[PDB]
Amino acid sequence: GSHMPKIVEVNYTWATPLSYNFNPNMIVYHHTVDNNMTPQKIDEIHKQRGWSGIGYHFYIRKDGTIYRGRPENAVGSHAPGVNARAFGIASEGNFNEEYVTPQQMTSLIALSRYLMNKYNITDLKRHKDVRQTECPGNNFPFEEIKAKLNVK
Ligand SMILES: [Zn+2]
């Protein structure tokens, strides 16, 4: 059946109760702005902001490594107003000033197709499509991702 790319599991200690009332029908793409960040650093920041921990379901570093964030069946903390219906995929970088690496692109396509097939998702969105933000940055290759995934 449909292939799952390599997802690195990360040991988190969740501060507040996770909700599993999560029914995804959307994928939302993010950038981190700051570089150099481990998934554990993101988790620390999101906890400061009052979230249980890392708000993204997945975090893709510059070398293409895909780290798990929130459990795949839990509500995240990445796009208030669509969190109960959206996977959140963050890429390491500030794409107002950077481009995604080739390894990030490879991982973005493989991970998106995995989620789309597993959950019957066709709706791809940038953070800035659902909320007022510059995320995921001017250079984020959204139209190219949609083209490779055959989404109109
Ligand atoms: Zn964002």
Side-chain angles (χ1 to χ4, degrees), residues 8-11 23 30 40 51 58 60 67 76 88 93 126 145 149:
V8 176
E9 300 304 332
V10 177
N11 293 317
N23 293 270
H30 300 270
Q40 295 87 353
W51 311 138
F58 299 95
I60 308 180
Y67 294 95
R126 298 172 291 182
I145 285 169
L149 293 167

Side-chain angles (χ1 to χ4, degrees), residues 29-31 56 78 127 133 135-136:
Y29 299 102
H30 300 270
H31 71 167
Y56 309 120
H78 67 89
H127 188 182
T133 180
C135 173

Side-chain angles (χ1 to χ4, degrees), residues 117-149:
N117 279 5
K118 180 170 179 185
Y119 297 101
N120 196 42
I121 295 172
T122 59
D123 189 4
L124 306 187
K125 296 280 156 44
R126 298 172 291 182
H127 188 182
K128 62 167 67 171
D129 297 320
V130 298
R131 305 272 289 179
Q132 180 185 334
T133 180
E134 299 202 302
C135 173
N138 296 327
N139 302 147
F140 188 83
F142 185 61
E143 290 301 327
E144 183 181 359
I145 285 169
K146 289 179 60 169
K148 287 178 159 175
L149 293 167

Side-chain angles (χ1 to χ4, degrees), residues 4-98:
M4 183 176 101
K6 177 71 186 103
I7 293 161
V8 176
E9 300 304 332
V10 177
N11 293 317
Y12 299 110
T13 299
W14 294 100
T16 65
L18 293 178
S19 173
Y20 297 75
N21 290 341
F22 180 58
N23 293 270
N25 66 9
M26 187 190 286
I27 294 164
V28 179
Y29 299 102
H30 300 270
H31 71 167
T32 59
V33 183
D34 297 327
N35 285 299
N36 284 5
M37 290 191 303
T38 57
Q40 295 87 353
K41 181 73 160 169
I42 296 180
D43 183 73
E44 170 187 316
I45 299 170
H46 284 185
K47 279 168 160 56
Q48 295 173 350
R49 295 180 183 165
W51 311 138
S52 186
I54 181 161
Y56 309 120
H57 296 91
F58 299 95
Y59 171 46
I60 308 180
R61 290 205 70 172
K62 282 195 184 324
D63 69 3
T65 303
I66 306 163
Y67 294 95
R68 198 157 322 250
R70 295 276 165 131
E72 204 176 284
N73 57 339
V75 180
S77 301
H78 67 89
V82 296
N83 276 314
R85 70 178 285 197
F87 287 114
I89 303 174
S91 296
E92 182 182 7
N94 175 358
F95 305 111
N96 285 339
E97 287 195 13
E98 296 192 288

